[PDB]
Structure formats: structure tokens, C-alpha cells
Amino acid sequence: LSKQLQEISDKLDIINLNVLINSTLTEITPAYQRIKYVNEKFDELTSEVIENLNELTELAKSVTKNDMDSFEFYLQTFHDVMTGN
Amino acid sequence: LSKQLQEISDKLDIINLNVLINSTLTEITPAYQRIKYVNEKFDELTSEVIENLNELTELAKSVTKNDMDSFEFYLQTFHDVMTGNNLFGRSALKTASELITKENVTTRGSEIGKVYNFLIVLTSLQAKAFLTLTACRKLLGLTDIDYTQIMNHHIDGQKREFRINILPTLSNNFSNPSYSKNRGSDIDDPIVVLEAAPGYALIGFEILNDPLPILKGYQARLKPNYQVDRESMSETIYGDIHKLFCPKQLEQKYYIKDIEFPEGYVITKIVFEKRLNQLGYEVTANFYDPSTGSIDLNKVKVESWKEKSCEEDSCEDEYSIIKAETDGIYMPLGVVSETFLTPIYGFGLTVDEKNQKITLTGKSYLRESLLETDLLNNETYLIASPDGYISSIVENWNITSDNTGSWRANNNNAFVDKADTIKGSSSLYTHKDGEFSQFIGNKLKPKTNYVIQYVIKGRPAIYLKNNKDTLFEDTKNNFSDFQTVTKKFNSGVNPSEIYFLFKNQSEYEAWGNNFIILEIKSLEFLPQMLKPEDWIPSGNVQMKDGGRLEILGDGYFKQFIKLENDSTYHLRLSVKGTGRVSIIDESKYLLFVNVKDEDLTRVIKNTSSKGECFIALEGTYVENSSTIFSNVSIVKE
């Protein structure tokens, strides 16, 4: 019984941690996903010509746009969730 | 306390999994919902006009727009969460596989097939999403980006994740979903053979109780790669399998016998053997060439009851004991089969008398039947397990479409109501004169039990007749929409002309479909030294149908049966009418018993035999009660 209770107490510590991961995922996931996509889609520039240059220029306009839901917003929220603000 | 701690530890494993589902939902839900909505709203285009075209053109402009929150963003994030390219390295496929493995309670198929079906619905969702994205670009007149390369890379990476980190788990056992209580037989010796056709192996079990306790079976050719031929499937239906499995008021022995065979072996024959309530079962599997199909009919193995013969003199062990309570025993109910059709190689008896839970369990080749086919993506000839009757003596049993060549659209107004997919499923229709004739009398046998299933709506008049007597009829119970019957009947004494006549219940409109007609194999029993011909009807009597030997008033049936002075016999017989059985020597009463309306369970010890042994199946001196025995069984122990 004492061994079964220790296995139960270990399972609870794993569950509690998974609940804390779920809290941080709820806080940080929309920023992490957007930062990742923007970083992956601009790899050549931060490392068909007219077509990709236009398709990336439209993305650049979306990225530099000063909205409440801007790229700067997602960067700041990523920093705040990382620090604990 | 240890049981309570185990229930607590199971609850924790369910909670931990639900927490991991919540993590993957937080990661994947905004993408899944948007992909789903875009896929559903562009269905006609990837399958009022100016208005719909303008609204879809505006939607297409929103979809193709190159923002941080674009449709391409949601597709990429969906792919990343599926593979496991997240903040913490967890994949949606892993949490989904862990989910399916836990909530596999009332699941028809295996863990591999459920997790793979989960992968198929997500890969199809993404593929349709890339297809709507190409359709939207073309509709707006923008340059083609060729999303085939990106879609293939996404699909292949997810299938690789499944193949490497998910699929190297499972088992292939299968059993009955539910149980049934029907007072079976202990007076009889039900032996039941479950043998496949020469080119077939047996491909599933099924237990019925709604028409009657019944065994339903399937058998089909075995294609290459442990897959099975569709059109070679069939159905076979056996009688009162409660009498094969449930004991009645006496205990039943159940030879737990996990008959299993090496690889390549396919069960071409099962015999189920219940003599003196000892449910053993002899099974013969043949070998089968994994490729090219062609089950080889030469390498057989027969492990009847003899898995303990290899280790113990008491091979009569390796069994169980179920005590028949007065309502019957929890025979299986539903289906002992595998999710997708495949040869079964093993089978075992897995009853549970702690809850009377009679459970059948065979060992299928499905793990193999798929690990080589869709895991390699070659043909995937996949057919899931069936639920009802697929075979029927009625041709066009439901309907094919627009054509009832078996039936007769005798009236113009009594046409088929829909004729194309407008009234739900295919269904006949009759109103104000309606009828549909179809000759199946040539397909009906004298004195044989047949199970009937059919679906009907409204005011139908079911008929199974030769315009002179009806084998089956239903012209009542006006119902809402297409309710199913699952009953039986016994085919007539001369049904050689009985045709089906689906008519209307009244002047109203009728609907019906799914006419299932198939034979129920009469339960057959192990032979014992009682044979009806040598019976000497002695006094106002004659031989009867159910092996019954009526005694009209007084008299008896007599017949010589040689008992031995070292062998035991078991006279098991019930009567209809107060009767007297007789085991007497030349002078003395080896047995002295009367039977009123009940069965007879007699275990006779050393029968000192001086030559003359017989039985005078007599009644008593009452004029009204015609003594009618039921089941002759003097089985020699």
C-alpha cells in the first residue's frame, strides 16, 4: 500500500506539472506560433523573383503594421510570459 | 484499500491524459476550427449565384491574404502541432493515440485502426484545405504557387511521425460487446461446427438475441497480404446458441481452450462441442500463403481440447464451471469479431462465471493485415466489420437504385418513392393499390428455420406467400421512419412457390427496404444410441416430430438398447404430459421414475446387465394428458 501511495504521489507531481505547462501554453502559444511562422517565412532575407518578393512585401506590411494585434505585441507578450509578468 | 488505490491510480491516468489533451487543444484548436470552416464553406467549389459567388470571392480574398494570421499560417501551425514542433516536444498524434488507447471501451476496431483513422481525418482535412487554397487563388485570378509540394511534405512528415513514434504499439484480441440471458439446454448435447468453405477462412462471429439466441457467421476468400475478398463474403446463421452456451438449471463445463496456431495458419474449421454441459470445441486451422492469397489446404492443425495434453494427464482440465441460475447465463450478445476483415488464427473460450459472462475470443491477423498495406500505402482494401445481415434470400435486399428487377412494380403510382437519394435510403413504396412481387419460393426449403430482418416506414403490408399461404407477414404498426425488424420464422411444409409481396397496409402510402432472409441452421446434437426406427409404438401411439414419441392416453414406446455392466449412461429427456420412463432389468427396477412435465437428469452407476435392457417410454392412466417426451438422449458416458 505504501508503494502504491508513492506511485500515486509521483503521478500527482507529473499531473500538477502538466497543469502548469497548460497554463504557460495558454499564455505563450499564440505569440510563439506567430513568431515561428514569421521567422521561417523570412529565412532567405534574414540569412518567381517578383512573385515571392511581392508575397513577402505584403507579409512585411502585415508585420510592421502598428495594431493591437501587431508583431511587436506578440514579441512583448512572449517576453512578459518568459519573465513572469 | 488496495482496490480503492488501483481505482485511484486509473483515475489519475485518465486525468493526466485529459490534461495532455487540453495542452494539444490549446495549441491546435484555432487552426483546426478555421481550416474546418474554410473547408465546409468552399465545398461546392472543391467538389443567388451572383450573391454566393461575390460572398465566396470576398472569402477567397480573406483566405489568400498574406498576413501573420493568414490561412497559410493556420495550415503551418496545424502541421507543426501534429508533428510535435511545439514549445515543449509533444505531438497531437501522441496525445490522440494515448486518448484512443484509454477510451477504447465500446470501440469496434483496434488501437492501430482507430489512431490511423484519426490520422486519416486530419490528413484529409489538410489536403482539402490546400485544395480550397488553390481553388481560392484560381477564383481570384492570382498566380499558382503549387501547394502540392508543401502538402506532400506535411502529409509525409505526419505519416512518418505516426510510423516511428506511434504505431510500434497494440494487440489483436476481440470479444463480444454485451451479454444475454436466455435459458439454454442441458438436456441436449449441442455440437456446433463453424467451418469455412474450402477457399475461405472464418472471418468473424456474431451473437443475436433479438430474433432469438443465434450465431451469425461470415466466411470469405483470403486475398494476398492477409486481406479478404469482399464479394466472396457470405453469412451463415445457426439456431438457439443460448442452448449452445447457456445452461438451464444445471451447471455447464466450459473448456477454456485458447486454440492458437503459428503464423500463416487460418481457421478453416471450428467445432463447438457441448456434451453433458462440457463446452469444449475442436478447431482445425489450415495454413495460408501470406502473399497471393491462396490458403493452402494441406497444412492443417487440430488442437481440439489438447493444449493441456502436452503437460497433464488430466487433459479434462483447462475448463471452467458456470452455474446455471434460473434465468439462464450471460451468453455473449452482439459480435465477437475484428474491426476490419482478416483471417483469425487463434481462438479461445473466455467465459466469466463470476458474472456468467460467456465471452468468445478469436485471434485475428489484422495487425499484420494492415501493417503491410496502408503503412506502405499500396492498395488498402479496407472493409470494417459489419453489424447486421449483408446476405439475404431477397435479391436487391434493400434496393440497388431505380431498379427492382427481383420485385415487380405492379402499379404505376406504386413506384419507388425516391428512386434517387431524395427519401433517405433506398426503399420500396406502395400506395392505394401497391404491391411488389418477387419469386423466392424456389429458394425456400420445407421445415427449416429462417431469420427475418427488414426496414419499413409508414403503412406497409409485408407478405411472404405463394398466393395460397403466407410464410411471413406484417401489415401493422405504422411507424415514424424506417424501423428495423429482426425476427424469425419456420419455412413452410412446401414453400417451393412462396414469393414476396410487399404491399401497402391500407390506401395510405407505404415504405420499406432491407429485406433480409436467411436460413437458421437447426441446432444439431451429438449422436447417442437412441434411434427412432427401432422404437416399437406400444398402444395408441406414433413417432413424432421433435423426437417426441406421443403417448395418446396410455401405452408406451419401447426399443432395445444394450446397457453394459461397466459403462454409465445418461438418460436426458423432458416430457409433455405425465409420463413414466423405465430402466428395468428382467425382474428389478434399475430405475423407477415418473415424469410429469419436466426433464430427466439421471446418472446411473454400474448397471448390472443380464442382457435384457430397454426403455418403455410410457405415460400414466389419465385420458387427457397425451404423454409427449421431448429429447431422446441415453448418451453413453
TrEMBL record, chain B:
Residues of the full protein shown: 152 to 803 of 803
Gene from which the chain derives: vip3Bc1
Top-level taxon of origin: Bacteria
Protein name in the entry: Vegetative insecticidal protein
